[PDB]
Amino acid sequence: AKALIVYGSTTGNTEYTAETIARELADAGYEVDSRDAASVEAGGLFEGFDLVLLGCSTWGDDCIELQDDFIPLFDSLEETGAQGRKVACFGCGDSSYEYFCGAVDAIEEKLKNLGAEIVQDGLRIDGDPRAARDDIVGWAHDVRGAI
Numbered sequence: 829a830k831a832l833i834v835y836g837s838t839t840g841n842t843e844y845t846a847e848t849i850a851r852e853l854a855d856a857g858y859e860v861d862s863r864d865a866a867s868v869e870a871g872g873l874f875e876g877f878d879l880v881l882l883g884c885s886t887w888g889d890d891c892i893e894l895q896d897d898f899i900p901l902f903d904s905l906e907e908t909g910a911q912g913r914k915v916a917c918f919g920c921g922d923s924s925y926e927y928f929c930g931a932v933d934a935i936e937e938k939l940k941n942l943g944a945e946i947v948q949d950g951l952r953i954d955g956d957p958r959a960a961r962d963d964i965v966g967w968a969h970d971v972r973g974a975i
């Protein structure tokens with residue numbers, strides 16, 4: 829099994845979440861390729877991968893903005909190879925805002941309409957993910973079961 833994890837992180841919280849999911853998948857025997865969205869290229873990005881996990885933090889406060897590094901990839905998601913691809917999404921936000929983790933919904937919706945296969949409901953972390961380390965580890969185990 830080959831997994832790709834692509835994350836957008838401004839203060840490092842979704843990055844830490846992606847490091848935690850990557851270690852759980854690697855420990856299970858998966859080959860994991862983890863990339864920061866600041867430097868990936870959308871075209872053909874998902875091709876070759878059995879599983880693709882997209883992480884992105886929510887910003888915006890009065891409206892939904894995706895983490896700034898992620899916006900180019902999200903804008904190019906039709907070009908990635910998402911149709912028929914098993915995917916799931918994750919991100920950090922704060923439930924005191926009106927659209928809590930609205931970036932994870934936006935990316936899930938977009939993937940669904942592209943004919944991707946969402947294998948697990950998105951992981952939406954409220955607060956410091958270092959304080960939710962066990963729900964992250966749990967969701968990573970769940971996604972492996974869903975493929």
Ligand SMILES: Cc1cc2nc3c(=O)[nH]c(=O)nc-3n(C[C@H](O)[C@H](O)[C@H](O)COP(=O)(O)O)c2cc1C
Pocket residue numbers: 836837838839840841842843884885886887888889890891892893895920921922923925926927928929930955
């Ligand atoms: C000015 C500001 C606005 C934010 N807006 C939202 C929001 O609209 N929804 C949400 O869930 N979280 C929101 N957040 C919380 C960030 O998503 C949270 O701090 C997250 O941990 C950042 O993850 P990152 O380090 O991976 O980019 C906001 C934070 C700040 C400082």
